[PDB]
Amino acid sequence: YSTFHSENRDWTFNHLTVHRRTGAVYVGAINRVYKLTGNLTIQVAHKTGPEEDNKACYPPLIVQPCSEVLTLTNNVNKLLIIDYSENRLLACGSLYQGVCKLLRLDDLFILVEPSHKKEHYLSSVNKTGTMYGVIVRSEGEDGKLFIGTAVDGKQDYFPTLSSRKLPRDPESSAMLDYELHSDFVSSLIKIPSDTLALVSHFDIFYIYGFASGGFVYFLTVQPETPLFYTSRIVRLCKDDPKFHSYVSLPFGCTRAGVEYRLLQAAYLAKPGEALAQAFNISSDEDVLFAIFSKGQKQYHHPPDDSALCAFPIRAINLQIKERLQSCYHGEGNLELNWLLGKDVQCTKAPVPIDDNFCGLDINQPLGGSTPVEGLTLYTTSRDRLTSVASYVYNGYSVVFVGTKSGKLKKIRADGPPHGGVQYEMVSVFKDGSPILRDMAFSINQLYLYVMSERQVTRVPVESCEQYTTCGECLSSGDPHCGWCALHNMCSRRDKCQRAWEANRFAASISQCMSSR
Amino acid sequence: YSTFHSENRDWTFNHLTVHRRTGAVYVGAINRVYKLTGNLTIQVAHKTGPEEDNKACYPPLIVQPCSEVLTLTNNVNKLLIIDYSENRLLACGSLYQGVCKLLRLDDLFILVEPSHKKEHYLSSVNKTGTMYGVIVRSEGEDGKLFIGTAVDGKQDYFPTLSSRKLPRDPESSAMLDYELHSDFVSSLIKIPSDTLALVSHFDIFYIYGFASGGFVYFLTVQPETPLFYTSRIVRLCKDDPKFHSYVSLPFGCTRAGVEYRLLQAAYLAKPGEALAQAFNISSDEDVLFAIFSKGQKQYHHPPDDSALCAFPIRAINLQIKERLQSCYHGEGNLELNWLLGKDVQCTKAPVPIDDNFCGLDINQPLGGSTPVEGLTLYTTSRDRLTSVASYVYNGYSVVFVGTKSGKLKKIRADGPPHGGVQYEMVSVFKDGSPILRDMAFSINQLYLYVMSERQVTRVPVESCEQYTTCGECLSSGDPHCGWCALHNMCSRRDKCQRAWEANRFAASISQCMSSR
Ligand SMILES: *[C@@H]1O[C@H](CO)[C@@H](O)[C@H](O)[C@H]1NC(C)=O
């Protein structure tokens, strides 16, 4: 398999995205952002470090001279998003309190590196898996960036969640400015200092985020408030600069007496037929696939026991609506201690709560303590699940799941009884290193780009050729595979010469015979 | 004695100031600010509350509807300062997050009450003894207010110390705005969240403040940082909107093996001759008089053991200069743990440190751990000292010291050996009510206005008539008293008929015989 090695064993890989039109592979790494061809040949290597820094220097070196002692510091890639409408890449690092660069897609030339305003500094956190962003731009206009990050106990320096202006012009003076910033109403959420005094390790880790319909969603993990942890879905309306639409519910999944409530990884996709039926949704609707490890404790040293589950966005929005309706009836409390700092009674008010409700000055920010439960598809306790991607093939949701021992599981989402069935597991990383969260399909869906800390590998979505009889091929459980009869070969339909002619491609067990 | 009683029983007096030209007496009270005559007849009673409020309402009712449950709430007066150049009074209360009013001196007509910006809310604290201000205005020009306050753990909402615009025009849109407010430099100090996580009862009480020379001074009490308390002098340059001149040193005094380091009260005045000789300063120079309780612990329930001591401003500034020169030579550390949050080494730089030094971006904010030691003048262990005022009469410093049992001590400062000698104690409040900090002279210096929580009383500075022979009178130790020979009466010079004529007023013991 095509593979790209880190140039240094120390400068590990962080993030990966694939341009959905050109097919170029962009990789964010320590001290580097790379542009690779589809087969993982380097085209551009853009250097982001190392550099002289100290994270006690606020503001950074470019603005003021600093007082504390500097050390050569690696630049951890924290964020890597293609800004599609504008043919550029947003790359945010850990250096200098977490400044971002905008880079031209073609050659990674620096368009702008805003480093003079307080909001130009996203976060001084130097851990990955702590920040996530979503660009909302109606194609061809000025845009907005929702950015969620851990703040490292630096509550006043960095909001944990905010929206920023992402104008068309890279040199606009409004670049990364808050959408709204005023004395009492701003497009940002700060961690309150009282929560940090109560829970000293307190911080919020943003594992994933996506847009779906009129809303953006962030998936978070954080210490629980009076070591237990809570995984949550956080939702905002796309048009809500006041942030009155903030709602946060816990989420997780369970199966056969086990609870999985520590979020590891997630991926938004469309469901195949049987999964759509199990949810009573159409196959056109969005479904969130998520990996959770067992229980609610020791987040930083998780057990191998883990699960893949699935949440339709419709069901998420429904549970949020019923929460809003209840609260607006005066029932219960807001239930978001970490942000509200105390019990806050829900206030009864005559307000229509429909699907598109985006909050008012009361009853917000809204939480809850009843979790959104997912449909568990697959579980294991031998090899911890670490990443997920999914797509539809031959009417089946196919879910690819990375493990901590560098394997890739292929799971067919069949529905009851099992929910999902693993039909194959492949060794990707010889060294047995964990697969990292970011996996993305090539434009033609023929491959999934998968990565470890030291390698990016282009893994074919199928290797049907391994099956050497019609019977084995069609009994494999792999939705990609059928029997190319005249060429004595198991393959995808489109890899079978003259597949359209009668008896040339057997797509079922019984067709093995009729083909013969 | 002329007395003014409070109109309710629970609506206690908080603050007092005498207009230095007109002799009008202004009293800050719970739910009232009064203007009284020199003999304590009400002229104006200005209603400041009670009003429905909740101190969890931020921003307060007056600018937003609040979902919180409100109680009818008393308005504690927390600040009362005459703005001399502008014929107005600044009156800050506890209601609505600590909004302030400017009232016309004549009739207490409301000139302005700022409450649309976040800086218009000084602090939701509702206890007295926590806030102090200093107006710095070149006469007939736009000016500035320095404001220190306790914040009750709401460090996100209110800075502990800041400088504000005080424009001549009461209707300026910039009224009480920060003098400087920008991303990385502002005319304010915030209490770090880390310090509150470390010490959860942490807060800073501003007991007194004054201008002298190029500088403003604030006298503070706060818990120590790793229950011990530190009393400090905090100094700023009058022209330093960047607050780079901030220097904070502990202060206190000692006598005969006892340490007194819990600040209770202060008053700035000129020294008489014995005191000025003792400091080796001019009688034209400022001296700070201070009351300290014994030790460094249990600030809220202090020992009766207390001291009066004096600090020449010249010596305070010298010790600060020495501190600044040492630090700019690279010796030691900044030593201000509550604000800096950690150990910070002093940075050597080739910078002249003269008397007028106002700091640069390095080596600030500056602290220190060696106390400024005052000259102890008087100690007691029998009845706690609560207030202080001083002036010069017949070339002597006379210090008036209030007590917790409603008494007023009169202390003559003679220097070595005793430092000071009490020559009279007077029972002001028969019921034993503690004397409050704010004591002020009438403009003819004939009286000291003294208050308890329930009364304001106009106390003659002498009652020489009590001594009924020449010998007793001139041995009284009371600097006010001489013998009016013809009228056989001990009195002040200006109460002795034809005192200007030879032999009519015996001002020494040998003059008893010749006047007879
Ligand atoms: C990968 O693809 C490029 C074309 O983009 C091709 O020229 C190159 O030879 C390929 N690399 C390998 C190892 O086959």
Give the closest residue to B135 by CA, choosing from B181, B174, B97, B89: B89
Q: What is the spatial distance between Cα B5 and Cα B32, in angstroms, rounded to a whole number?
A: 13
Which of B194, B196, B328 is the best substitution to test chain A (most A C-beta atoms within 10 A)?
Answer: B194
Tell me if A37 CB under 6 Å of ligand 1.
Answer: yes
Q: Where are the beta strands (DSSP E) in B23-67?
A: 25-29, 32-36, 42-47, 51-53
Chain A: nearest CA to B200, how far in angstroms?
8
Contact: A193, B347; criterion CB under 8 Å: no
**How far does CA B232 lie from the centroid of its chain?**
13
Contact: A192, B156; criterion CB under 8 Å: yes
Q: What is the spatial distance between Cα A103 and Cα A119, in angstroms, rounded to a whole number?
A: 19
Residue numbers after which chain A is interrupted (C to N above 2.5 A) read: 226
Q: What is the 3-state secondary structure (H, E, C) of B282-330?
A: CCCCCEEEEEEEEECECCCCCCCCEEEEEEEHHHHHHHHHHHHHHHHCC
Let me know how long chain A is. 516
Cis peptide before A192 (omega within 30 of 0): no
Contact: B155, A200; criterion CB under 8 Å: no
* B248 DSSP 8-state letter: E
Amino acid found at B274 = A
In chain A, DSSP finds a helix count (H) and a strand count (E) of 7, 33
| Tokens encoding A15 | 């993030």
Give the closest residue to A83 by CA, choosing from A24, A36, A143: A143
Q: What is the spatial distance between Cα A111 and Cα A101, in angstroms, rounded to a whole number?
A: 7
Q: What b/e string do you get for A490-506 counting C-beta neighbours within 10 Å, with b at 16 or more?
A: bbbeebbeeeeeeebbb
Beta bridge partners of A295: A260
Contact: B183, A362; criterion CB under 8 Å: no
Q: Are B386 and B264 spatial neighbours (Cβ–Cβ below 8 Å)?
A: yes
Beta bridge partners of B221: B205, B231
CA of A39 to the centre of ligand 1 (A): 6
Q: What is the spatial distance between Cα B205 and Cα A245, in angstroms, rounded to a whole number?
A: 39
Cis peptide before A365 (omega within 30 of 0): yes
Burial of A333 (0-12, 13-18, 19+ CB in 10 A): middle
Tell me if A39 CB under 6 Å of ligand 1.
Answer: yes
**Which residues are CB-contacts of B418 (< 8 A; sequence separation ≥ 6)?**
none
Residue with tokens 């000789």, as numbered in its chain:
B277
Which candidate from A67, A118, A193 shows the least CB-CB separation from B193?
Answer: A193
Contact: B193, A63; criterion CB under 8 Å: no
Contact: A156, B190; criterion CB under 8 Å: yes
Which candidate from A118, A153, A362 shows the least CB-CB separation from B67?
Answer: A362
Contact: B197, A192; criterion CB under 8 Å: no
Query: Please, what is the Cα angle at B25 between B19 and B30, to 5 degrees?
Result: 125
Q: Are A11 and A30 spatial neighbours (Cβ–Cβ below 8 Å)?
A: yes
Q: Are B162 and B187 spatial neighbours (Cβ–Cβ below 8 Å)?
A: yes
| Tokens encoding B36 | 């009284």
Q: What residues of chain B lie within 8 A of the CB of A63, using their CB?
A: 184
Q: Rounded to 5 degrees, what are φ and ψ at B515? A: -65, -15
Please give the residue of chain A at the shortest CA–CA distance from B118. Answer: A183
C-alpha dist (Å) from residue B56 to A72, A242, A333, B41, B345: 46, 20, 16, 38, 40
C-alpha dist (Å) from residue A82 to A24, A107, A166, A286: 11, 14, 12, 21
Residue with tokens 């200005």, as numbered in its chain:
B46
| Tokens encoding A35 | 């542009």
H or E stretch including B258?
Answer: strand B258-269
Amino acid found at A411 = I
Please give the residue of chain B at the shortest CA–CA distance from A340. Answer: B56
Q: What is the spatial distance between Cα A157 and Cα B199, in angstroms, rounded to a whole number?
A: 21
H or E stretch including A197?
Answer: helix A193-198
| Tokens encoding A516 | 């013969």
| Tokens encoding B476 | 């009284």
Q: Where are the alpha helices (DSSP H) in A210-302?
A: 273-279
| B13 three-class SS | strand
Q: What residues of chain A lie within 8 A of the CB of B156, using their CB?
A: 156, 190, 192-193
**How far does CA B315 lie from the centroid of its chain?**
19
| B155 three-class SS | coil
DSSP per-residue letters across A315-370: HHHHHHHHHHHHHTTT-SB---HHHH-S--BPPP------TT----SSS-SB--SS
| B263 three-class SS | strand
Q: Are A80 and A26 spatial neighbours (Cβ–Cβ below 8 Å)?
A: yes
H or E stretch including A514?
Answer: helix A509-515
β pairing state of A372-380 and A247-255: parallel
Q: What is the spatial distance between Cα A126 and Cα A128, in angstroms, rounded to a whole number?
A: 7
Q: What is the spatial distance between Cα B232 and Cα B347, in angstroms, rounded to a whole number?
A: 23
Contact: B183, A155; criterion CB under 8 Å: no
Residue with tokens 């207030």, as numbered in its chain:
B387
Contact: B118, A194; criterion CB under 8 Å: no
Ligand 1 atom nearest A40 alpha carbon: 1
Q: Furthest-apart CA pair in chain B: how many Å? A: 82
Ligand 1 atom nearest A41 alpha carbon: 1
Ligand 1 atom nearest A2 alpha carbon: 13
Q: Where are the alpha helices (DSSP H) in A252-308?
A: 273-279
Q: Are A241 and A253 spatial neighbours (Cβ–Cβ below 8 Å)?
A: no
State the number of CA atoms in the 13 A half-sphere of B516 facing the CB: 12
DSSP per-residue letters across A143-170: EEEEEEE--TT-TTT--SEEEEEE-SST
Q: What is the spatial distance between Cα A56 and Cα A9, in angstroms, rounded to a whole number?
A: 27
Residue with tokens 């780079």, as numbered in its chain:
B244
DSSP per-residue letters across B317-376: HHHHHHHHHHHHTT-SB---HHHH-S--B---------TT----SSS-SB--SSPEE-EE
Q: Where are the alpha helices (DSSP H) in A83-187?
A: 95-98
State the number of CA atoms in the 13 A half-sphere of A49 facing the CB: 28
Burial of A228 (0-12, 13-18, 19+ CB in 10 A): middle
Say which experimental method was used.
X-ray
CA of A41 to the centre of ligand 1 (A): 7
User: What is chain B's Cα-based Rg?
Assistant: 24
| B177 three-class SS | coil
Q: What is the spatial distance between Cα A134 and Cα A209, in angstroms, rounded to a whole number?
A: 6
Burial of A49 (0-12, 13-18, 19+ CB in 10 A): buried
Q: What residues of chain A lie within 8 A of the CB of B194, using their CB?
A: 153
Q: Are B50 and B75 spatial neighbours (Cβ–Cβ below 8 Å)?
A: yes
Please give the residue of chain A at the shortest CA–CA distance from B363. Answer: A67
Q: What residues of chain A lie within 8 A of the CB of B153, using their CB?
A: 194
Data resolution in angstroms: 2.1
**Which residues are CB-contacts of A485 (< 8 A; sequence separation ≥ 6)?**
A470, A503, A504, A505, A506, A515, A516
Please give the residue of chain A at the shortest CA–CA distance from B345. Answer: A68
CA of A467 to the centre of ligand 1 (A): 28
| Tokens encoding B16 | 């007092």
C-alpha dist (Å) from residue B139 to A64, A124, A360, B62, B135: 37, 47, 49, 33, 11
Let me know how long chain B is. 516
Amino acid found at B194 = D
Q: Are A162 and A189 spatial neighbours (Cβ–Cβ below 8 Å)?
A: yes
Give the closest residue to B451 by CA, choosing from B9, B27, B24: B27
Q: What residues of chain B lie within 8 A of the CB of A176, using their CB?
A: none
Q: What is the spatial distance between Cα A291 and Cα A262, in angstroms, rounded to a whole number?
A: 8
DSSP per-residue letters across B390-433: EEEETTEEEEEEEETTSEEEEEEEEETTTEEEEEEEEE--TT-P
Please give the residue of chain B at the shortest CA–CA distance from A69. Answer: B345
Give the closest residue to B426 by CA, choosing from B446, B391, B447, B401: B401
Interface of B with A (CB under 8 A): 59, 64-65, 67, 117-118, 153, 155-156, 183-184, 190, 193-194, 196-197, 200, 344, 347, 361-362
Q: What is the spatial distance between Cα B33 and Cα B49, in angstroms, rounded to a whole number?
A: 10
Query: Please, what is the Cα angle at B156 between A348 and B192, to 5 degrees?
Result: 145
Give the closest residue to A245 by CA, choosing from A382, A395, A361: A361
Q: What is the spatial distance between Cα A207 and Cα A218, in angstroms, rounded to a whole number?
A: 8
State the number of CA atoms in the 13 A half-sphere of A177 facing the CB: 12
Give the closest residue to B149 by CA, choosing from B138, B157, B141: B157
| Tokens encoding B455 | 């009364």
Q: Are B209 and B219 spatial neighbours (Cβ–Cβ below 8 Å)?
A: yes
Contact: B59, A184; criterion CB under 8 Å: yes
Contact: B59, A362; criterion CB under 8 Å: no
Give the closest residue to B174 by CA, choosing from B187, B191, B183, B193: B187
Q: Furthest-apart CA pair in chain A: how many Å? A: 81
Amino acid found at A39 = N
Q: What is the spatial distance between Cα B153 and Cα A463, in angstroms, rounded to a whole number?
A: 63
Residue with tokens 């905090």, as numbered in its chain:
B234
State the number of CA atoms in the 13 A half-sphere of B333 facing the CB: 11
Chain B: nearest CA to A344, how far in angstroms?
9
H or E stretch including A216?
Answer: strand A215-223
Q: What residues of chain A lie within 8 A of the CB of B155, using their CB?
A: 193
C-alpha dist (Å) from residue A311 to A373, B76, B377: 8, 55, 77
Q: Are B91 and B79 spatial neighbours (Cβ–Cβ below 8 Å)?
A: yes
Beta bridge partners of A396: A393
CA of A2 to the centre of ligand 1 (A): 10
Q: Are A295 and A259 spatial neighbours (Cβ–Cβ below 8 Å)?
A: yes
State the number of CA atoms in the 13 A half-sphere of B417 facing the CB: 1
Which candidate from A59, A361, A362 shows the least CB-CB separation from B184?
Answer: A59
Residue with tokens 């009417």, as numbered in its chain:
A395
Q: Rounded to 5 degrees, what are φ and ψ at B466? A: -60, -25
Interface of A with B (CB under 8 A): 59, 63-65, 67, 117-118, 153, 155-156, 183-184, 190, 192-194, 196-197, 200, 347, 361-362
Contact: B156, A361; criterion CB under 8 Å: no
Tell me if A155 CB under 6 Å of ligand 1.
Answer: no
Q: Rounded to 5 degrees, what are φ and ψ at A263? A: -65, 130
Ligand 1 atom 7: residue of nearest CA:
A41
H or E stretch including A88?
Answer: strand A88-92
Which of B57, B176, B183 is the best substitution to test chain A (most A C-beta atoms within 10 A)?
Answer: B183
C-alpha dist (Å) from residue A462 to A446, A447, A511, B290: 8, 8, 21, 85
Q: What is the spatial distance between Cα B4 and Cα B40, in angstroms, rounded to a whole number?
A: 6
Q: What is the spatial distance between Cα B495 and Cα A169, in angstroms, rounded to a whole number?
A: 84
Q: Reduced to 3 DSSP states, what percent helix, strand and coil does chain A have, rounded to the nearest 5?
A: 10, 40, 50
Amino acid found at A179 = E
CA of A42 to the centre of ligand 1 (A): 10
| Tokens encoding B284 | 């034209």
| Tokens encoding A450 | 């998968």
Q: What residues of chain A lie within 8 A of the CB of B347, using their CB?
A: 67
Q: What is the spatial distance between Cα B295 and Cα B228, in angstroms, rounded to a whole number?
A: 9
Q: Which domains are present in chain B?
A: 1-462 (2.130.10.10), 463-516 (3.30.1680.10)
Sign of CA dihedral A273, A275, A281, A285: negative
Contact: A184, B64; criterion CB under 8 Å: yes
Tell me if A41 CB under 6 Å of ligand 1.
Answer: yes
- What is the side-by-side order of every strand in the sheet holding A440-441? A3-5, A455-460, A447-451, A440-441
Q: Are A75 and A51 spatial neighbours (Cβ–Cβ below 8 Å)?
A: yes
| Tokens encoding B515 | 């006047």
Q: What b/e string do you get for A1-40 counting C-beta neighbours within 10 Å, with b at 16 or more?
A: ebebebeeeebbbbbbbbbeeeebbbbbbbbbbbbbebeb
Give the closest residue to B180 by CA, choosing from B132, B269, B274, B243: B243
Give the closest residue to B133 by CA, choosing from B170, B81, B89: B81
Ligand 1 atom 5: residue of nearest CA:
A37
Q: What is the spatial distance between Cα B54 and Cα A455, in angstroms, rounded to a whole number?
A: 58
Contact: B184, A64; criterion CB under 8 Å: yes
C-alpha dist (Å) from residue A1 to A413, A437, A460, A467, B105: 26, 19, 8, 18, 86
